[PDB]
Amino acid sequence: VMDHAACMVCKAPATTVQHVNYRRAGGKEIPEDLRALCRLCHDACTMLEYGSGMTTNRIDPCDPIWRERILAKRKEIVEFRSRGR
Amino acid sequence: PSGKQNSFAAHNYPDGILVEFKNSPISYANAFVRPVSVVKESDLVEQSIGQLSNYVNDIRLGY
Amino acid sequence: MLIEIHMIQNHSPANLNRDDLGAPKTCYFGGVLRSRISSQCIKRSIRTSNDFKALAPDIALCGRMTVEAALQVAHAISTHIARPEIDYFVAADDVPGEDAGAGHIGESMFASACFYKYFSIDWEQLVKNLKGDTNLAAHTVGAFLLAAAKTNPSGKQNSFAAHNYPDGILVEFKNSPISYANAFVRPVSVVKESDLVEQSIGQLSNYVNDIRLGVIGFWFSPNNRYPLGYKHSKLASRNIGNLNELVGAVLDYIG
Amino acid sequence: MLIEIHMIQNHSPANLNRDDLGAPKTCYFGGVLRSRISSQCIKRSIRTSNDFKALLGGVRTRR
Amino acid sequence: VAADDVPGEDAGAGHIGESMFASACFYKYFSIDWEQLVKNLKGDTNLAAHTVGAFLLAAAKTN
Amino acid sequence: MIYLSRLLIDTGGNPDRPRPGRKWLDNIYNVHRRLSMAFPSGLRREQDPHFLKPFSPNDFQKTPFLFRVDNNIDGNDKRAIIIVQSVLEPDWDYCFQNALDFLAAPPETKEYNPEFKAGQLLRFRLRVNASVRRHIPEMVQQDGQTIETGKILHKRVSLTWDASSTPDQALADWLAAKSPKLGFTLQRCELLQLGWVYGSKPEPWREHKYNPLRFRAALLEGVLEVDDPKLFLKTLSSGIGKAKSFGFGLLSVLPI
Amino acid sequence: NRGTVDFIASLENLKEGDLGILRKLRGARLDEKLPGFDLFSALWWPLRQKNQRAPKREVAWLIAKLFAEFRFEQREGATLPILMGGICRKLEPKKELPRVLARFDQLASLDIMQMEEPLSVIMGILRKHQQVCLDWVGLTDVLSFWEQEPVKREWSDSFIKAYKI
RNA sequence: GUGAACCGGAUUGCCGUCAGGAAAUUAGGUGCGCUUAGCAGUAUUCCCCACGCUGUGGG
Ligand SMILES: [Mg+2]
Incomplete structure (x- = not known):
């Protein structure tokens, strides 16, 4: 709502959400550690956090340090995915 | 150490030395109680130095 | 009233x-073999030390020829199953001869363990044998905390330089003398996502979560490295990150 | 006055x-297997190091 | 998709699957030892020369 | 000294590659929001100069901005064209600093200035939604049989014409009727896009809702004449029809 | 256990090209290749949503890559230290048997992100002896439960009792 | 204070030193994604503010 259905890294129309930390999870979630993300960048984020040893604190799209390689990643999900469930 | 160095010529030099001057001996091996697992970013010496720096900061801000 | 100190090292x-x-x-x-440090070992390590040497102090803390010293320590029971190991050494002749090897060519024994160490002080009798010197007794209790925080058993250490520091100290002022050794009837099994000290401190936390259900507690970890109880529950009265402020809080509670 | 050396190699x-x-x-x-180098091996390698020929002054022999 | 010739049922196929393929520019490397070839044919030098020439022809003209 | 530029959209290439620009243009509110953010408030640039925060339109400023959606500069490349104008300085390096996949070529901007005279010919393209405010009988449920009440609903019906009239001179008569009010007079204009334009809108624990935005767009082109130069300066950057903020009011200043 | 049997069934229902793109992904992670991550998402995300007892990410990825490489049928009562261990009775006990035993012994001292290579050589030893069946479900729930000591204990003495028959 | 109180098992040390897993090998034979389509010749266009209700301030 406050993100206005807009992505946070590329400002595309958003359709899903992503978690920043798993200190609270399962059902107990409060809306200050969640980032509203679009379909094409949530997949990139999950592609990046799976084996980086991210433990609990996931990738934040709200700091400059973690962003510059997110675009380099999002370059090639467009490149190779078959659009055709 | 001169072990099997003729067959294993491992003469690598240390990447980090901390020389501290204090009246009480400190073992920083408790930094590595949790084993160091590799990740995609950084290397093992960087991860170990980060863990050691975390423990050094904790000891200085502790004892 | 009794000051109880449970240290994980x-x-x-x-x-x-x-x-x-x-x-x-x-x-x-716990139905398994544990590594032990004897009580008198820790007693003599704390005594006779310039870390602690800096009516008569330290005669009341550890007695000498019916003193009945206020401070006594329990045998350091490990939180996990003991893992004794053989180290094989040789001593070179370092003179060129027709043979090689000259020393004992023997084997030493070593082990690494996470020890639970129990300390108990009675305050009233510690004042009693100090002839009412309450300030001196507070200073010597602070000195006990300072020493036992940073003194190790001066055993075989020239070849095994083990100078590790405790990662957790729990100080309570409860009514009856209780040891939390029953917390570690489970030997600590190590998981991939947690380390040995964190699991031992968690076992202690899950055991002090009981007893109260069926007093206070000051918890010290260096810069809050290991919090007693990974929740917001009222389990530790004060999470303390530094040893000096821990000693200050304990002293200002006592006086 | 204690001089403390902590090295990562x-x-x-x-x-x-x-x-x-x-x-x-x-x-x-820490409950896991760790590769170990004996302290006596390090002491021997230091005593028989090239930075010790001008300083080595002891013999430990039975002959 | 393998299509059934007889229309005895609805417009199905038969067998459906994936074949995999690629296109590439290949670098091929061959090494012939002349003296080892001479020794192996027990000194028949003309046989070794014929073998080398036919190998050069067959490496190029046969896929 | 108006601010006319070009945003360039691919709308082509390999169909297998997901192209976010293609779904960016296939809705009104997406391009509206993206071009509305393209004039950020000045305190945000001092606070966050890197476009790296969850935005809020209250922090943004509001201006009657407007754009134009065209396409097809040929020469063996199908390409789509966005022509924007408003009154304040826009920024394109700030706006599309993470959206390089949106475009097919870097944007370019120059300085342009319009001039008008009395009785001078012009060439123009406009887009006005066909909107006629009418009282309608309500028609709901539609469960097998029609059900109406005496209430007359008020809305803007799309333009309809009699059966003995083609759409062409019907829209020509619309433009001829609207010309002397706005301040010009034409002799002929050509219809080349009559159709339907669809969109959706989100709005404020809350949820999100989808409703089909509806507009009967009419894009025309060709040969304009003016009656007075003073009746045209207040028309640019404001719009002449409806759906003004939605990109339906650009005056093509091409005097030829 | 639910969530694991259907994972094995969906892996067994995979076609040849999908197994090929899993085979090429062997030896590395899934952040450098798209179709590996798309396939892991397709085979994990709906089964993760549908069941609470879905396996952990990295062990599921490891079993997916190993099943793509080796392709043994799922059969109950055919876990690793039974099949290997019955294989360990037909070897020379003084030299060869300690070497294969150390190859199986290595498995008890890895974490989850290098574990696939010693498993690969063990399953290669299995393939060299024409072993068609493996308890894939058993292997994956004992591999996801790797954090405990009793599970490795019953693993080990299962190897022992397979050896003493 | 209870066969209890006071109470170290202390220190002296390189396993070291020799080593090619080696020689041999086509993954082949079989295969249509395919059958339907105006981005637009209109009859409610989802609306918040406003005209004697058909202009007017725009989401
Ligand atoms: Mg994005």
Whole structure:
């Protein structure tokens, strides 16, 4: 709502959400550690956090340090995915 | 150490030395109680130095 | 009233206490074999030390020829199953001869363990044998905390430089003398996502979560490295990150 | 006055120290197996180091 | 998709699957030892020369 | 000294590659929001100069901005064209600093200035939604049989014409009727896009809702004449029809 | 256990090209290749949503890559230290048998992100002896439960009792 | 204060030293994704503010 259905890294129309930390999870979630993300960048984020040893604190799209390689990643999900469930 | 160095010529030099001057001996091996697992970013010496720096900061801000 | 100090100390591979045959001292608990440091070992390590040397102090803390010293320590029961190991050494002749090897060509014993160490002080009798010197008794209790925080058993340490520091100290002022050794009837199994000291402190936290259900507690970890209880529950009265402010809080509670 | 040296050293595949059966020395630390180098081996390598010929002055012999 | 010739049922196929393929520019490397070839044919030098020439022809003209 | 530029959209290439620009243009509110953010408030640039925060339109400023959606500069490349104008300085390096996949070529901007005279010919393209405010009988449920009440609903019906009239001179008569009010007079204009334009809108624990935005767009082109130069300066950057903020009011200043 | 049997069934229902793109992904992670991550998402995300007892990410990825490489049928009562261990009775006990035993012994001292290579050589030893069946479900729930000591204990003495028959 | 109180098992040490897993090998034979389509010749266009209700301030 406050993100206005807009992505946070590329400002595309958003359709899903992503978690920043798993200190609270399962059902107990409060809306200050969640980032509203679009379909094409949530997949990139999950592609990046799976084996980086991210433990609990996931990738934040709200700091400059973690962003510059997110675009380099999002370059090639467009490149190779078959659009055709 | 001169072990099997003729067959294993491992003469690598240390990447980090901390020389501290204090009246009480400190073992920083408790930094590595949790084993160091590799990740995609950084290397093992960087991860170990980060863990050691975390423990050094904790000891200085502790004892 | 009784001051109880439960210390969790992970020691690097060494041999702090030796029996007759050179093995690390070993006890039996939880239905498994544990590494043990004897009480008198820790007592003499805390005593006779310039870290602690800096009516008569330290005669009341550890007695000398019906003193009935206020401070006594329990045998350091490990939180996990003991893992004694053989180290094989040789001593070179370092003179060129037709043969090689000259020394004992023997074997030493060593073990690494996370010790639970129990300390108990009675305040009233510690004042009583100090002839009412309350300030001196507070200073010597602070000195006990300072020493036992940073003194290790001065056993075989020239070849095994084990100078690790405790990662957790729990100080309570409860009514009856209770040891939390029953917390570690489970030997600590190590998981991939947590370390040995965190699991031992968590076992302690899950055991003090009981007893109250069926007093206070000051918790010290260096810069809050290990919090007692990974929740917001009222389990530790004050999470303290530094040893000096821990000693200050304990002293201002006492007086 | 205590001088404390804490070094982090990454080594190539090697066998610097071995036990009776020719296996690298291993010790349990933090509940897991850790590769171990004996302190006597390091002391011997320091005493027989090239930075010690002008300083070596002791013989430990039975002959 | 393998299509059934007889329309005895609805417009199905038969067998459906994936074949995999690629296109590439390949670098091929061959090495012939002349003296080893001479020794192996017990000194028949003309046979070795014919073998070398036919190998050069067959490496190019046969896929 | 108006601010006329070009945003360039691919709308072509390999169909297998997901192209976010293609779904960016296939809705009104997406391009509306993206071009509305393209004039950020000045305090945000001092606070966050890197476009790296969850935005809020209250922090943004509001201006009657307007754009134009065209396409097809040929020469063996199908390409789509966005022509924007408003009154304040826009920024394109700030706007599309993470959206390089949106475009097919870097944007370009120059300085342009319009001039008008009395009785001078012009060439123009406009887009006005066909909107006629009418009282309608309500028609709901539609469960097998029609059900109406005496209430007359008020809305803007799309333009309809009699059966003995083609759409062409019907829209020509619309433009001829609207010309003397706005301040010009034409002799002929050509219809080349009559159709339907669809969109959706989100709005404020809350949820999100989808409703089909509806507009009967009419894009025309060709040969304009003016009656007075003073009746045209207040028309640019404001719009002449409806859906003004939605990109339906650009005056093509091409005097030829 | 639910969530694991259907994972094995969906892996067994995979076609040849999908197994090929899993085979090429062997030896590395899934952040450098798209179709590996798309396939892991397709085979994990709906089964993760549908069941609470879905396996952990990295062990599921490891079993997916190993099943793509080796392709043994799922059969109950055919876990690793039974099949290997019955294989360990037909070898020379003084030299060869300690070497294969150390190859199986290595498995008890890895974490989850290098574990696939010693498993690969063990399953290669299995393939060299024409072993068609493996308890894939058993292997994956004992591999996801790797954090405990009793599970490795019953693993080990299962190897022992397979050896002493 | 209870066969209890006071109470170290102390220190001296390189396993080391020799080593190619080596020679041999086509993954082949079989295969249509395919059958339907105006981005637009209109009859409610989802609306908040406003005209004697058909102009007017725009989401
Ligand atoms: Mg994005």
